[PDB]
């Protein structure tokens, strides 16, 4: 009975009492991050629990002709909030996460969603769509902002990625039999210890409806899905002034 959460900030909040349980990861111990291998030797700090709390970032709708969506991690909150300014003026970042997506369906509604968190994913961009003519994709698809971006082809994930072979990542189902909300757990993984928040892209989410949305005419056409995230025990290194360069 450890599927509880105490959350209250701003003016509203969301907590659960009899939700769809949780998913455990790696069966492991708590720890901080490696400190005695950086370029410099200065002592680290610990920002603690100053600002880490949940604000929803988008309530994505699900419709009859949903084609797929995703996000860029951690580009979602790198530009907004005191966390945004801290990430902008600070070079090194690391923290854990507890992803909680709210996904409810009514008695009338039937269907399921294909929500897959894909780490380390080199993003499959539009790249001109065809890509045979050298017209480079503009910046309006590299830094979309809080809106995310629309993925082109589901069963190849814009990169040749056949759908049935996505099973490697933590796989989740959205069904009124299964869950009133889904939980995703991911720690901090990178092939290199230290990097900037503007050059390197870690990964992003992915959502493609595994089942088409259907309902007899007379019901709600779209289904909103809410997402929020708050990193737990966040620590930032490369402490410096408010200087981008």
């Amino acid at each position: 009975s450890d599927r509880v959460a105490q959350l209250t900030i701003g003016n509203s909040t969301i907590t659960t009492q009899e939700a769809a349980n949780i998913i455990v990861g790696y069966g492991e111990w708590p720890s901080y991050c490696s400190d005695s291998d950086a370029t410099a030797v200065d002592k680290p700090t610990r920002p603690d629990v100053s600002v880490n709390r949940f604000y929803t970032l988008d309530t994505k709708l699900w419709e009859k002709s949903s084609k797929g969506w995703y996000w860029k991690f951690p580009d979602v909150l790198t530009e907004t909030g005191v966390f945004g300014q801290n990430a902008q003026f600070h070079y090194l970042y690391r923290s854990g996460f507890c992803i909680h997506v709210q996904c409810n369906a009514s008695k009338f509604h039937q269907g399921a969603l294909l929500v897959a968190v894909l780490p380390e994913y080199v993003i499959g961009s539009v790249a001109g769509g065809t890509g045979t003519e050298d017209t480079h994709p503009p910046y309006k698809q590299t830094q979309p902002g809080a809106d995310g971006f629309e993925l082109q082809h589901p069963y190849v994930l814009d990169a040749g990625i056949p759908i049935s072979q996505l099973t490697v990542c933590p796989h989740q189902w959205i069904n009124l039999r299964t869950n009133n909300c889904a939980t995703i757990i991911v720690p901090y993984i990178n092939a290199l210890p230290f990097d900037s928040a503007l050059n390197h892209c870690n990964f992003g989410l992915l959502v493609v409806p595994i089942s088409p949305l259907d309902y007899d005419q007379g019901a709600t056409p779209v289904i909103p899905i809410t997402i929020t995230l708050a990193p737990m025990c966040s620590e930032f290194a490369g402490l410096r002034q408010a200087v981008t360069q």
């Binding site: 111990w29 901080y32 065809t130 890509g131 092939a191 892209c201 025990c233």
Partner: protein, 297 residues
């Protein structure tokens, strides 16, 4: 002194990557045997369902029974990680006496696994890797015979300037040792350790390996890093005795000291450049051929 206890909430005991969950080791384990049908409780682990592992409140097998199977197979030496190499064509190059593709008399090729995607894509199924490599250069005639000529091999370490003439300074390569080989000696066989600047080779990586603001000018460095690479190899003929026969080389590749991570699934499409996510969208075809019906062929 010791008055306030605000910070004591910490959880010292650092073991692995950041998280908050906790577990505990156990000294020994558990076992299970097999039996037949019986209505009893307490101890009944005989059968195992991978997810449920029990019987629902609606009976699954109330009508018939099951059977048993015995094992006689061994799995000790079935691992493939390093031994998965088998036969397959690899590739070749040529150094003719008179030609247009080689107006200089020497050939300098950039060393990489990006040689020929046909078989590299089999190894390219992963992203983060640590391995040993081997390069074999076998020399012969373009016709397919053997001729007693005078040849030798010079290595180009990374960071050295790329030769632009038959008499460049790159031939001295002071910090590069020398290998005593000749056409009479067995063909080239050189080991290559893991000198990646990072923990693994970067192919599926979205970033900017050059400092400064990112613009349309600085986009070609995807895959072809001018300096981050492990160098090239230059081949020519040294000495006053110039060869009177054109020559050809075949390049053989082999990998040792396997250590991999990050499983990445199979690709059913084609690229157009190195690590280019672009695909033939107008002619997408599934990974397998289907039929008008599944019942009959």
């Amino acid at each position: 002194g010791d008055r306030v206890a605000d910070v004591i909430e910490s959880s010292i005991g650092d073991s692995v990557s950041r998280a908050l969950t906790r577990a505990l080791p156990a000294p020994t384990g558990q076992d299970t045997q097999v039996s037949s049908h019986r209505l009893d409780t307490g101890k009944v682990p005989a059968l195992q369902a991978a997810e449920i592992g029990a019987s629902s409140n609606a009976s699954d097998e109330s009508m018939i029974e099951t059977r048993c199977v015995l094992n006689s197979h061994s799995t000790a030496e079935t691992t493939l990680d390093s031994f998965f190499s088998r036969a397959g064509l690899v590739g070749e190059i040529d150094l003719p006496l008179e030609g247009t593709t080689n107006p200089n008399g020497y050939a300098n090729w950039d060393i990489d696994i990006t040689g020929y995607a046909q078989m590299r894509r089999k190894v390219e199924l992963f992203t983060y890797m640590r391995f040993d490599a081997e390069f074999t250069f076998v020399a012969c005639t373009p016709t397919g015979q053997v001729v007693p000529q005078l040849l030798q091999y010079m290595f180009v370490p990374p960071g050295a300037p790329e030769p632009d003439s038959r008499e460049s300074l790159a031939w001295q390569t002071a910090t590069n040792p020398s290998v005593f080989v000749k056409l009479s000696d067995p063909p080239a066989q050189v080991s290559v350790p893991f000198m990646s600047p990072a923990s693994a080779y970067q192919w599926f990586y979205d970033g900017y390996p050059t400092f400064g603001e990112h613009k349309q000018e600085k986009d070609l460095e995807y895959g072809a890093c001018p300096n981050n690479m492990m160098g090239t190899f230059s081949v020519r003929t040294v000495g006053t005795s110039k060869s009177k026969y054109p020559l050809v080389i075949r390049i053989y590749m082999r990998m040792k000291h396997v250590r991999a991570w990050i499983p990445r699934p199979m690709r059913n499409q084609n690229y157009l450049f190195k690590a280019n996510p672009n695909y033939a969208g107008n002619f997408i075809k599934p990974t397998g051929a289907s039929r008008t019906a599944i019942t009959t062929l």
